[PDB]
Scaffold this motif. Structure first.
Motif, PDB file in Angstrom:
ATOM      1  N   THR A   1       4.749  23.783 -20.061  1.00 59.20           N
ATOM      2  CA  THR A   1       3.416  23.531 -19.576  1.00 59.20           C
ATOM      3  C   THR A   1       2.712  22.060 -20.550  1.00 59.20           C
ATOM      4  O   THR A   1       3.276  22.130 -21.731  1.00 59.20           O
ATOM      5  CB  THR A   1       2.471  24.783 -19.757  1.00 59.20           C
ATOM      6  OG1 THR A   1       2.489  25.057 -20.964  1.00 59.20           O
ATOM      7  CG2 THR A   1       2.973  25.388 -18.871  1.00 59.20           C
ATOM      8  N   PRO A   2       1.984  21.852 -20.284  1.00 55.35           N
ATOM      9  CA  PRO A   2       1.421  20.420 -21.282  1.00 55.35           C
ATOM     10  C   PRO A   2       0.996  21.150 -22.513  1.00 55.35           C
ATOM     11  O   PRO A   2       0.768  20.378 -23.609  1.00 55.35           O
ATOM     12  CB  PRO A   2       0.182  19.626 -20.518  1.00 55.35           C
ATOM     13  CG  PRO A   2       0.593  20.093 -19.150  1.00 55.35           C
ATOM     14  CD  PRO A   2       1.198  21.432 -18.995  1.00 55.35           C
TER      15      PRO A   2
ATOM     16  N   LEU B   1       9.744  16.871 -18.972  1.00 56.51           N
ATOM     17  CA  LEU B   1      10.223  16.755 -17.631  1.00 56.51           C
ATOM     18  C   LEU B   1      11.490  17.649 -17.165  1.00 56.51           C
ATOM     19  O   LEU B   1      11.605  18.265 -16.019  1.00 56.51           O
ATOM     20  CB  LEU B   1      10.567  15.423 -17.277  1.00 56.51           C
ATOM     21  CG  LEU B   1       9.219  14.518 -17.419  1.00 56.51           C
ATOM     22  CD1 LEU B   1       9.823  12.989 -16.998  1.00 56.51           C
ATOM     23  CD2 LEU B   1       8.016  15.101 -16.358  1.00 56.51           C
TER      24      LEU B   1
ATOM     25  N   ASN C   1       1.289  18.033 -27.108  1.00 58.94           N
ATOM     26  CA  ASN C   1       1.020  17.251 -25.907  1.00 58.94           C
ATOM     27  C   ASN C   1       2.192  16.299 -25.503  1.00 58.94           C
ATOM     28  O   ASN C   1       1.569  15.073 -25.197  1.00 58.94           O
ATOM     29  CB  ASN C   1      -0.374  16.495 -26.371  1.00 58.94           C
ATOM     30  CG  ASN C   1      -1.506  17.420 -26.409  1.00 58.94           C
ATOM     31  OD1 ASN C   1      -1.696  17.820 -27.668  1.00 58.94           O
ATOM     32  ND2 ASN C   1      -2.258  17.830 -25.613  1.00 58.94           N
ATOM     33  N   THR C   2       3.220  16.982 -25.322  1.00 56.67           N
ATOM     34  CA  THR C   2       4.423  16.287 -25.231  1.00 56.67           C
ATOM     35  C   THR C   2       4.956  16.642 -23.581  1.00 56.67           C
ATOM     36  O   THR C   2       4.807  17.662 -23.281  1.00 56.67           O
ATOM     37  CB  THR C   2       5.588  16.534 -25.949  1.00 56.67           C
ATOM     38  OG1 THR C   2       6.067  17.806 -25.731  1.00 56.67           O
ATOM     39  CG2 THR C   2       5.202  16.188 -27.252  1.00 56.67           C
ATOM     40  N   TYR C   3       4.975  15.547 -22.580  1.00 59.20           N
ATOM     41  CA  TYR C   3       4.944  15.860 -21.265  1.00 59.20           C
ATOM     42  C   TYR C   3       6.604  15.997 -21.032  1.00 59.20           C
ATOM     43  O   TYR C   3       7.373  15.085 -20.697  1.00 59.20           O
ATOM     44  CB  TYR C   3       4.276  14.760 -20.286  1.00 59.20           C
ATOM     45  CG  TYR C   3       2.998  15.019 -19.985  1.00 59.20           C
ATOM     46  CD1 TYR C   3       1.929  15.020 -20.879  1.00 59.20           C
ATOM     47  CD2 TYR C   3       2.647  15.465 -18.629  1.00 59.20           C
ATOM     48  CE1 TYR C   3       0.620  15.001 -20.463  1.00 59.20           C
ATOM     49  CE2 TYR C   3       1.370  15.567 -18.468  1.00 59.20           C
ATOM     50  CZ  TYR C   3       0.158  15.165 -19.227  1.00 59.20           C
ATOM     51  OH  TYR C   3      -1.027  15.792 -18.837  1.00 59.20           O
TER      52      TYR C   3
ATOM     53  N   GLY D   1      11.339  14.696 -21.821  1.00 59.26           N
ATOM     54  CA  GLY D   1      10.180  14.240 -20.842  1.00 59.26           C
ATOM     55  C   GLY D   1       9.614  12.804 -21.291  1.00 59.26           C
ATOM     56  O   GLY D   1      10.504  11.961 -21.791  1.00 59.26           O
ATOM     57  N   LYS D   2       8.432  12.456 -20.791  1.00 61.48           N
ATOM     58  CA  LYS D   2       7.817  11.216 -21.298  1.00 61.48           C
ATOM     59  C   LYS D   2       7.490  10.756 -22.603  1.00 61.48           C
ATOM     60  O   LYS D   2       7.161   9.613 -22.829  1.00 61.48           O
ATOM     61  CB  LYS D   2       6.392  11.163 -20.193  1.00 61.48           C
ATOM     62  CG  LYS D   2       6.741  11.352 -18.705  1.00 61.48           C
ATOM     63  CD  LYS D   2       5.405  11.342 -17.811  1.00 61.48           C
ATOM     64  CE  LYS D   2       5.414  11.937 -16.631  1.00 61.48           C
ATOM     65  NZ  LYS D   2       6.495  10.774 -15.902  1.00 61.48           N
ATOM     66  N   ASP D   3       7.863  11.616 -23.564  1.00 56.50           N
ATOM     67  CA  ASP D   3       7.642  11.198 -25.018  1.00 56.50           C
ATOM     68  C   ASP D   3       8.663  10.298 -25.394  1.00 56.50           C
ATOM     69  O   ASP D   3       8.504   9.446 -26.287  1.00 56.50           O
ATOM     70  CB  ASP D   3       7.609  12.598 -25.682  1.00 56.50           C
ATOM     71  CG  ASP D   3       6.848  12.094 -27.331  1.00 56.50           C
ATOM     72  OD1 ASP D   3       5.801  11.809 -27.314  1.00 56.50           O
ATOM     73  OD2 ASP D   3       7.994  12.154 -28.185  1.00 56.50           O
TER      74      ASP D   3
ATOM     75  N   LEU E   1       5.287  22.253 -16.344  1.00 57.07           N
ATOM     76  CA  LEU E   1       5.883  20.734 -16.357  1.00 57.07           C
ATOM     77  C   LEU E   1       7.451  21.072 -16.330  1.00 57.07           C
ATOM     78  O   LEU E   1       8.120  19.946 -15.901  1.00 57.07           O
ATOM     79  CB  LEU E   1       5.702  20.083 -17.661  1.00 57.07           C
ATOM     80  CG  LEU E   1       4.108  19.554 -17.946  1.00 57.07           C
ATOM     81  CD1 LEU E   1       3.945  18.787 -18.968  1.00 57.07           C
ATOM     82  CD2 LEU E   1       3.628  18.746 -16.354  1.00 57.07           C
TER      83      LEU E   1
ATOM     84  N   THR F   1      -0.003  24.518 -13.633  1.00 54.11           N
ATOM     85  CA  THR F   1       0.463  23.297 -13.951  1.00 54.11           C
ATOM     86  C   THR F   1       1.766  23.261 -14.904  1.00 54.11           C
ATOM     87  O   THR F   1       1.440  23.049 -16.121  1.00 54.11           O
ATOM     88  CB  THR F   1      -0.558  22.292 -14.602  1.00 54.11           C
ATOM     89  OG1 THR F   1      -1.593  22.389 -13.581  1.00 54.11           O
ATOM     90  CG2 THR F   1      -0.114  20.746 -14.224  1.00 54.11           C
TER      91      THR F   1
END
Length: 723
Positions: free
Chosen positions: A137-138, A158, A154-156, A172-174, A113, A111
């Protein structure tokens, strides 16, 4: 006939200056300032032959397809030419060019990212690594040279994008945009950021959030600043584009699917492109117009260009739900989603019409199989030309004789596709090969679409190639379709390029401006052109042919000077001629000058003979390759000078007698032309007054077989006798 040579010099300067001033992208879009934005793509002349003819499909290797059947991140690495694919961190990089060089990697947990390829800082790293792989990675991000790891709280992440000077930016999503400093991560700050774009020339970083908010970040001239210049909401972009359009539904302005950087080689005024679904191009300026050194201040919209389908007279279907796009040197390649599996590739370019003040483009649609995940792409300046050199970059037709086609790779699940953009010379070659010979109907349309001058220049590019069938067909097409005269002038100007107005010397000591290999390539192209002319307005064309031959001989002389010690040859010369050489051009040396060429030849021959070597070889070579700059008179003068210089040794007295006698015999038939008062000085210096009397008597008897000049010659005899 020096006037005919001089006249063709303005003809070359005309076509050189014609291809020196070309419209900028902002000028092509008919915008004047960032206060009055313009809208195009709907006036029935914005979008009036194979744009690309290269379809090479290399399937994905079955070892990877088997694992794919069982994450599905994909991408390409054009710097390393190894496309990669991801199935839960089992990242394998295969060579998309031939489907080889599988590189398995599943060391750490699954997994991943984000995947990025970074060109590392050249300062602190082992020389054996050339690139860096950044896997996100996560739990953490690992950087591997081609080392150690860095944790992400813990920042996703992208997306990962690298600058030319080695700065790695993740997003990313943060909602925040981070940078990796190498190690540490630094935050430069609900809305995930999907894309990061880098403008390497002007050091501008762009983002593209999930909602549609575009934020411009300024790296500064150094490239380490990273200050947020602007932050424009998607609704602001939609409203601005609607106000500029006033007749276009806003649903095409939203959402934004791609942002691309418009390089400084393409525009000094426009620095960003936004491609939205249905293929809508929104041109954004971040810096003031025509200010190459002005840092970004705000993100403004200056132009709205529509896809080919928007025009009322256009019968082309509009692009639909485009998900990938690239913009490179005026070529837009965007991938529309035909279905869940298939795809459509749109190629829009204006290389066919590079000088038209309003933008004039052509489009091509190619249906392909496989959802697109990675669509990517695989001048001589002198101080006497700095004010005339066009700043950004030359168009395609200017340098199509020596530049290869631009190559792109499109990677999908089925496999990679390699294609390249056809240059106009490539399109003419395709037309000639497809047709039976070198004439017909498709060639006429090619010569009509381009101007006769540009089309004949392209035809000469194909016809001066030295396989034979295409050369003969191109020659027939050139002679079948004053247009030929202008085509020859343009092709000769494009062969010479920025060297015709350039000085043959650039200070450093004193060395040649053009490199040896570039000079040899130009020499081979000019040799092909000269052979073409010899095998086949008449007075002007003959003068231009003579200019071409003279410039070819001058270039051969320059190349052979570069082969020898060019620094020594230029340095061993009188200071006035060297200073004249500083501020003279190739145009003036070929045409205006008639002294510097002989001075360079004399310096070369003197350097050759000061090595205590026979001049009979280099003199024969110079007479063979430079008949105009080196005559038989120069040959006998060089031989006699060599004899005089090598007769300054006291090895034997009888050895001097025959050598000086044969040198005098050589000088007998050349006394009228050159150096009558010059060689007598060294003649008396080598204690050969008997020779001085004889040489001056020969000069008196041959120069004036009038009375006053013969008495002037006898004055030299009197001066030598009194000496």
């Amino acid at each position: 006939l020096q006037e005919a040579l001089e006249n063709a010099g303005r003809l070359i300067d005309r076509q050189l200056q014609e291809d020196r001033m070309y419209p900028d992208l902002s000028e092509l879009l008919m915008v004047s300032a960032p206060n009055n934005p313009t809208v195009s793509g709907m006036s029935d002349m914005d979008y009036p032959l194979p744009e690309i003819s290269s379809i090479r499909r290399v399937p994905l290797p079955p070892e990877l397809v088997e694992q794919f059947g069982h994450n599905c991140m994909m991408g390409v690495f054009p710097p390393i030419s190894r496309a990669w694919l991801t199935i839960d961190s089992d990242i394998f990089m295969w060579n998309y060019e031939d489907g080889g060089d599988l590189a398995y990697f599943d060391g750490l947990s699954e997994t991943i990212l984000a995947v990025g390829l970074v060109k590392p800082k050249a300062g602190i790293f082992q020389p054996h690594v050339r690139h860096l792989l950044v896997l996100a990675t996560p739990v953490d991000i690992v950087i591997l040279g081609l080392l150690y790891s860095l944790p992400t709280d813990n920042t996703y992440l992208l997306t990962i994008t690298s600058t030319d000077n080695g700065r790695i930016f993740l997003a990313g999503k943060d909602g925040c945009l981070y940078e990796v400093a190498y190690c540490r991560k630094i935050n430069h700050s609900d809305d995930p950021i999907l894309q990061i774009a880098i403008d390497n020339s002007r050091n501008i970083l762009y983002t593209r959030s999930e909602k549609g908010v575009i934020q411009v970040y300024d790296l500064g001239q150094d490239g380490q600043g990273m200050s947020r210049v602007a932050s424009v909401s998607q609704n602001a972009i939609v409203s601005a584009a609607g106000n500029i359009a006033r007749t276009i539904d806003r649903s095409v302005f939203k959402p934004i699917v791609q942002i691309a950087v418009i390089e400084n080689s393409e525009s000094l005024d426009c620095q960003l492109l936004a491609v939205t679904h249905a293929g809508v191009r929104l041109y954004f300026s971040t810096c003031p117009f025509r200010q190459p050194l002005a840092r970004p201040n705000t993100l403004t919209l200056v132009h709205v260009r529509l896809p080919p389908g928007f025009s009322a007279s256009s019968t082309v279907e509009k692009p639909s739900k485009v998900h990938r796009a690239l913009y490179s040197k005026g070529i837009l390649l965007m991938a529309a989603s035909e279905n869940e599996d298939n795809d459509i590739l749109w190629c829009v370019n204006h290389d066919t019409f590079p000088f038209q003040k309003p933008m004039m483009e052509t489009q091509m649609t190619a249906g392909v199989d496989g959802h697109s995940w990675a669509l990517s792409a695989i001048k001589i300046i002198t101080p006497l030309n700095k004010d005339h050199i066009p700043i950004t970059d030359s168009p395609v037709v200017v340098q199509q004789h020596m530049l290869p086609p631009k190559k792109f790779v499109l990677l999908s699940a089925q496999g990679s596709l390699m294609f390249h953009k056809l240059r106009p010379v490539d399109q003419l070659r395709h037309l000639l090969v497809s047709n039976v010979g070198g004439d017909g109907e498709e060639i006429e349309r090619f010569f009509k679409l381009h101007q006769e001058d540009q089309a004949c220049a392209t035809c000469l590019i194909l016809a001066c190639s030295t396989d034979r069938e295409v050369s003969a067909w191109a020659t027939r097409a050139f002679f079948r379709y004053s247009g030929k005269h202008n085509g020859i002038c343009i092709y000769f100007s494009r062969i010479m390029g920025n060297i015709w107005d350039a000085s043959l010397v650039v200070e450093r000591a004193i060395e040649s401006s053009v490199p040896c290999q570039l000079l040899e390539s130009v020499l081979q192209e000019l040799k092909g052109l000269q052979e073409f002319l010899d095998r086949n307005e008449k007075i002007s064309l003959q003068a231009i042919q003579q200019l071409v031959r003279k410039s070819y001989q001058a270039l051969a002389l320059w190349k052979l000077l570069c082969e020898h010690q060019f620094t020594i040859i230029v340095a061993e010369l009188q200071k006035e001629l060297q200073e004249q050489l500083k501020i003279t051009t190739f145009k003036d040396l070929v045409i205006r000058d008639k002294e510097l060429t002989g001075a360079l030849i004399a310096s070369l021959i003197n350097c050759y003979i000061r090595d205590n070597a026979a001049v009979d070889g280099i003199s024969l070579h110079l007479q063979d390759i430079c008949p105009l700059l080196y005559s038989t008179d120069d040959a006998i003068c060089s031989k006699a000078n060599e004899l005089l210089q090598r007769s300054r040794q006291v090895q034997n007295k009888t050895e001097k007698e025959r050598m000086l006698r044969e040198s005098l015999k050589e000088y007998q038939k050349i006394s009228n032309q050159v150096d009558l008062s010059n060689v007598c000085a060294q003649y008396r210096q080598v204690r050969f007054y008997e020779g001085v009397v004889e040489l001056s008597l020969t000069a008196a008897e041959k120069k004036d077989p009038a009375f006053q000049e013969r008495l002037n010659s006898y004055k030299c005899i009197t001066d030598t006798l009194q000496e």
